[PDB]
């Protein structure tokens, strides 16, 4: 929260409304965007603010305050411009309300997130040609739970995404400003440069036929690398480890070492290019040959790629086939032949790190399945014929 001034200024500069138009700020509180817009564009507008907490609603006399749950409020009028910084979070009573939300919002998938709902509601309250400018996390660009939100936006209007990054005081959230015009078109991806005067936009690329696919920062080098290799997801089955509880509810699993016992490995045992079979980080041990009973692949030496180490590719070949409590487990597909040592070297390479960092920056904190499935494998490390 607490939208930094330079961010509010940037958003206000992308905003527009016809003289007399209705300007709305959902989850307004004291109305930071209502005020800023008026100061920058003028008084000739109808300013409206919606707040649910009667103790937060602190608006000037020129603004029409409204106490309601934006997500469930049904006004009788559409709006020209919607400005705001929607609440970031899940389920906030809670589960009770959540179900009404789940039935009210069509883009709601998985645990979703409140900001996605605000976006859909906002678009639905917009009149044709209307404009919304929101600051939100960058997770919806790549995450699976936001696939429906992406399709929605793509089909309802033209979308512009301005990458800001980690601009808020709390540093682990990457922000993005979305400028949506309810006048169908495609997607424009912009980057920004932070200077003393604030942000300066820089057009990165445009996708006029965008229909909701993941948004990435592509360059000629990424494109090149991807067309000249095959997707890792065509050569391997990506499997998931058993969660810690499965192990604890499994007999033969001890919480103290002993002879014949092997440590249940975690992401701390995975190093770039090697596995540390020595240090136990889970506090669980079990007879190696018994791991096969939790997941069959535990008995097969295979490739392990990290999902806990952030947005980078850390991989190793588990030659010993130990039980794992996490990470991605890759099993080659039928007929795929590969060179483990060179594949591993390739995945941990600088070029691979540069490639991934270029595309997804810091949108999300960990490498996801969708990012992993598309990693290009040079045909000289593995192939299916
Ligand atoms: C992200 S804050 C934005 C505050 C302020 N506009 C700013 O930019 O700093 C969302 C505010 O709207 C209110 N709010 C939270 N959940 C809401 C909901 N479901 N419906 C309506 N208002 C909500 C809260 O009081 C909260 O202060």
Distance 238 CA to ligand 1 centre (A): 40
85 given a catalytic annotation: yes
- Which of the residues 33, 47, 118, 168 is marked catalytic? 168
What letters, b where the CB count within 10 A reaches 16 and e where it falls short, cover 33-46? bbbbbbeebeeebb
Phi, psi of 347 (to 5 degrees): -65, -35
Place of tokens 């494998």: 377
Label the pairing between strands 126-137 and 79-84.
parallel
Q: Is 320 exposed, middle or buried (0-12, 13-18, 19+ CB in 10 A)?
A: exposed
163 given a catalytic annotation: no
Domain extents in the chain: 1-215, 216-384
Q: Is 341 exposed, middle or buried (0-12, 13-18, 19+ CB in 10 A)?
A: exposed
**1-215 has which CATH code?**
3.40.50.150
And the tokens for 317? 């070949």
Experimental technique, in short, is X-ray
What letters, b where the CB count within 10 A reaches 16 and e where it falls short, cover 206-215? eeeebebebb
Can you give the C-alpha Rg of the chain in angstroms?
25
> If you take atom 18 of ligand 1, which residue's CA is the nearest one?
69
Q: How far apart are the first and last CA of the chain?
A: 53
Residue to probe by mutation, ligand 1, list 23, 29, 66, most atoms within 8 Å of CB: 29
3-state helix, strand, coil in the chain (%, to 5): 30, 30, 40
Measure the CA–CA gap between 159 and 187, rounded to whole angstroms. Answer: 5
| Superfamily of 216-384 according to CATH | Adenine-n6-DNA-methyltransferase Taqi, Chain A, domain 2 (3.90.220.10)
Distance 153 CA to ligand 1 centre (A): 22
231 given a catalytic annotation: no
């Amino acid at each position: 929260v607490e939208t930094p001034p330079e961010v509010v200024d940037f958003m206000v500069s992308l905003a527009e409304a016809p003289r007399g138009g209705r300007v709305l700020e959902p989850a307004c509180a004291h109305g930071p965007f209502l005020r800023a817009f008026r100061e920058a564009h003028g008084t000739g507008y109808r300013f409206v603010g919606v707040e649910i907490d009667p103790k937060a609603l602190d608006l000037p006399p020129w603004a029409e305050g409204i106490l309601a749950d934006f997500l469930l409020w049904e006004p009788g009028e559409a709006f020209d411009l919607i400005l705001g910084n929607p609440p970031y979070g899940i389920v906030g009573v809670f589960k009770a309300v959540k179900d009404l939300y789940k039935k009210a919002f069509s883009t709601w998938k998985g645990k979703y997130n409140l900001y996605g709902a605000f976006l859909e509601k906002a678009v639905r309250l917009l009149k044709p040609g209307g404009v919304l400018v929101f600051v939100v996390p960058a997770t919806w660009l790549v995450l699976e739970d936001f696939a429906l939100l992406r399709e929605f936006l793509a089909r309802e209007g033209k979308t512009s995404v301005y990458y800001l990054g980690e601009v808020f005081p709390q540093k682990k959230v990457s922000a993005v400003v979305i400028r949506f015009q309810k006048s169908g078109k495609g997607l424009s991806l912009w980057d920004t440069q932070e200077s003393e005067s604030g942000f300066t936009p820089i057009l990165w690329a445009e996708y006029p036929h965008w229909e909701g696919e993941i948004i990435r920062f592509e360059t000629e080098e990424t494109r090149k690398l991807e067309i000249s290799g095959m997707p890792l997801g065509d050569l391997f089955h990506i499997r998931f480890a058993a969660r810690s509880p499965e192990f604890k509810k499994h007999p033969a699993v001890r919480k103290e070492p002993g002879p014949g016992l092997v440590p249940v490995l975690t992401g701390r045992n995975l190093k770039p290019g090697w596995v540390d079979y020595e240090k136990n980080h889970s506090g669980l041990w079990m007879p190696k040959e018994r791991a096969k009973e939790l997941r069959d692949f535990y008995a097969t030496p295979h490739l392990v790629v990290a999902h806990t180490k952030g947005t980078r590719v850390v991989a190793a070949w588990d030659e010993r086939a130990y039980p794992w409590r996490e990470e991605f487990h890759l099993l080659p597909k039928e007929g795929v032949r590969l060179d483990p040592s060179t594949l591993v070297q390739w995945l941990n390479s600088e070029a691979m790190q540069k490639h991934v960092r270029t595309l997804y920056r810091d949108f999300v904190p960990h490498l996801t399945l969708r990012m992993l499935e598309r990693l290009p494998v040079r045909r000289e490390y593995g192939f299916h014929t």
